[model samples]
Target: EIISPHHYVYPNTTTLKNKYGIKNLNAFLEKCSHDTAKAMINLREESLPEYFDTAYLCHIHQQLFKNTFEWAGYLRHIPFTFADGTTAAMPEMKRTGWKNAFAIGDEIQEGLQRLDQTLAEKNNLQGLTREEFNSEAIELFNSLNQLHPFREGNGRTQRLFFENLAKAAGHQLNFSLITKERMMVASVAVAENGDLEPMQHLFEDISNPEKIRLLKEFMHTMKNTGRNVNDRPVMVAKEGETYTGTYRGAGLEGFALNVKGAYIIGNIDHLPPEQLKILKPGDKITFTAPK
Candidate 1:
């Protein structure tokens, strides 16, 4: 059991344990880690381009846990605070409305656009020295950290978002060296006191060729484990065989599939519109059996 100094309403333990299918908070957290790792692998495979919009960030979150949580793609409406009694201070909470959130999003987007344009003017982030690149990235990371749009999984989502940006700017970020405790402390300081130096150090540590190589290898290993879209495994079926497996993509989970003589059958009735639009008949789907 965990205790906190801050008081906020959360879903009932029974509801989360029974309906969400986790036995306890610890189990839920473990599942989140597994789901997020798979999501990161999928993002690498997709090689999506960077977009600085908040909605795009939300989409990343949705993609990360679409199979794990029913409300994956939706913006957070509930308020939250840390165990230390520090509020998240996200836009459009009790103190601010939608207008505040939009304004903040617009400001961050405009700043990022300017940064991208500057990089483009200098031939795509090549002109910047390591220090310069780290500075700009720190600024951008701080801005997004302050936004804190999601109720959960903000850290993983933002890290991936910035990773995309770093790649666009001709660099790679390897955050594997940074411990979660160090990051959490630094992030709180940055969010509360507007300090950038702590995060700058963190950013500098990750902005290197060696770290980049390690990051790539790690992602490759994760990717090799399975074929996932939206953190759900794609199914594999052979001709004249029956394939019965859980399909957990497109907002459906534990869905039964019947493999016909030459085709696999699955339903997409509850998939979100964006995912539904991408589906087509006869598209080749690949799946890797568990080792």
Candidate 2:
């Protein structure tokens, strides 16, 4: 049997008691989801400086989950792993030393700054070919993901951080194109074997210009319609329920139905005009559950 004081692995009732004083794990997770989403929406309106630094990353983590976790911006003092013992890519354990974690963060920041400077020198990243951009972006993303700075919400914070960085560099990264399953596999590979190729391909597909444009338009429309991107309501439906709603982007299409999780499709290029008109940027629709 496994047991720990960390809320992450604790029994449902105990975890709730230890963390948010909520009654159950589902409720706790729901609260976290909503809070983090709100944080991301709030962050969307603000502009970060062009430089990427450790402090900024910590701030991003804090901003994303400050409402949900007391330890939001602080370095984690406990060790965590994914998939039990099956995964070999465990992050630096807290028991080792905070200095080691900080040092790793420093290396990541330095690399990002150098990459930013290099891209600026190369004509604001406009001159880089797709392959060049993907290669560099993957290297940066993989390095930061390996650091896994926050005790919780590392994935959410890191994604927002990199998205902001990409915008500053004249490229839009649409992470919605890739499934979470694929991203996890790639990140794990990078963590365990130091393999960058899997993530390199993932970023390559994500950096598509058309996809970026579509995502930007979707976000813009969502904002215009007074829909906070982070606070989109998650609706439940059975397998054949008809989902009708003004979704922010294509990412919500699949989940608009019976899916238990959320996603942002972030693309509209492939949608037919008729279907697209119904689901267009901001039109509101209600999904009916099965009888």
Candidate 3:
């Protein structure tokens, strides 16, 4: 059955007591926040039909503003009145009417369509790899992000949803090390109609099957070393050169560092000369075996 946006529609209301079956705004906000958080964390692509419906909007609105002073009155631009007759207004949301409704609707539909198209193109679910899924997800996400739905909180909400969606797909979603500073740069890139390189640093998948093969070889040789110190560093002997393994304590110290020469490529700040030659996101990076 096709899901309509109304099912997930969030309505504007002044009091949580009226919207939810709770006594106060605090209790209502907590419940809504917790529910949305759990849904975001546990949601899978299959569950999108259910979670992306308008029914989820009610919870989202409440959750998105839970810790804030406004709580239930957030979207309404209503000021909070204290017992002493003082009041405070929510910060003006820097969004246009087109953004909140038309833009949001278009973005939602676009993401949904791309997701379906990507899955259908896969043909056999005979275990389509995570790299493939991640690549497609990036296309969908970037498109939706460019739409910039709301006056505020679009990026933050999208991130929470994306992280949870990845977890649902059985991939670990860890953006913790991706500092806020970098994320801001990513936002700026979107604003300036630039490439998504700032954001790509956190999202790219370097763990393709070919990389795993080399890692296996390195690990096997390390196991056979049988040195006096079990914790000592390992080394790989090549025809013309000896490659000494850096001690990370753990075999892999950071995320996305497993692939061949990935550590060098992962840093967004330093693009290679060839990469510098490309002016757009569609540019291809390629290398071939020497005959």
Candidate 4:
């Protein structure tokens, strides 16, 4: 069972926060997460008949989500198997995970079969370029991932899949320099097909040395600022001990103040546990942002 990460938040905000908190949300994700599937269904159910057909969207989301999830996890086996000697538990679900080795449950196997059949119907690309391919790929990629599939690692896994897909299409994906721009392009693509034009333009811009240098500088500054503000000492909560604190940047930044008669009780999960300090009421434990 591949237990992925999930937090209570909207898909877009969750995607952005994860992007800021982790190196790559898409990293190490395997196959489709329940959340992704749910989001796709929700989108189709809410949309109009002409906007996007349910069947078409369903097939697209399933194939894209599963392929991307597998890509992020670095799962190379076309037919992943588990210890029980079965491809998957439910072939229709498209959910796969690692059990010592990669395994596709029956549901996922079924989903793949369905996807293969669907793709066979649309095998003719109707003449699309690498740019067009990337535009569509990123659109579906963002949609499924934004749904926050699995319990964790959605962004990292999606990014891995995105890069791999680009590479497979004979293009070197340069996410190292265009994270925000790429995300912006993806957001647009998902909202409106017309947004693809901008993405096509951005893809071309990536090849420019000036644009690359500027992006690198921008990224460096952003990283420098984040490091300067983040790194607050981890706060440990003791059993039956009440402590009050505000979360910063979803644990990325924040400060905790010990009120009442609390002390340094002990350590939990590498964080300083709160307890009754040896000193009097005036004494306090303090932490500052690293310089």
Best by lDDT: 2
Instruction: Report the lDDT tens digits of candidate 2 across residue range 1-291.
Output: 232334344444444232455767788888877778888888878876655665677788878876775556665533333233311112234545433232243554465456556545664454556667666767667666655655567777778777777777677676644445667767777766778766765575467654444344444544567545343322122223455545543554232221223433322333444765555546564544334
Count of steric clashes across candidates, in order: 0, 5, 6, 36
Error of 2 at 223 (Å): 17
- Give the Å error, residue 236, model 2: 28
- List, residue by residue over 1-291, the lDDT tens digit for candidate 1: 132212223345432311246757778778877877888888777766544555667788889977666546554433334444433223333434432232243454465455556545554444566777777777667666665556457788888777776677677666644546557756877766667666765575467553334333333434656743233221222223334433323223212232332212233332344645664444333432222
Top TM-score model? 2
Better candidate number, 2 or 4, judged by TM-score: 2
lDDT of residue 203 for candidate 3? 61
Each candidate: what lDDT?
0.52, 0.55, 0.41, 0.37
TM-score of candidate 3 to 2 decimals: 0.39
RMSD to the hidden true structure, all candidates? 18.7, 11.7, 14.4, 19.5
Worst window of 10 by summed lDDT in candidate 2:
82-91
- Alpha-carbon shift of residue 37 in model 1 (angstroms): 2.4
Q: Could you tell me the lDDT of residue 144 within candidate 2?
A: 62
- Which of candidates 1 and 4 is the stronger one according to TM-score? 1
Query: Comparing candidate 2 with candidate 3, which one achieves the higher TM-score?
Result: 2
**TM-score of predicted structure 2:** 0.54
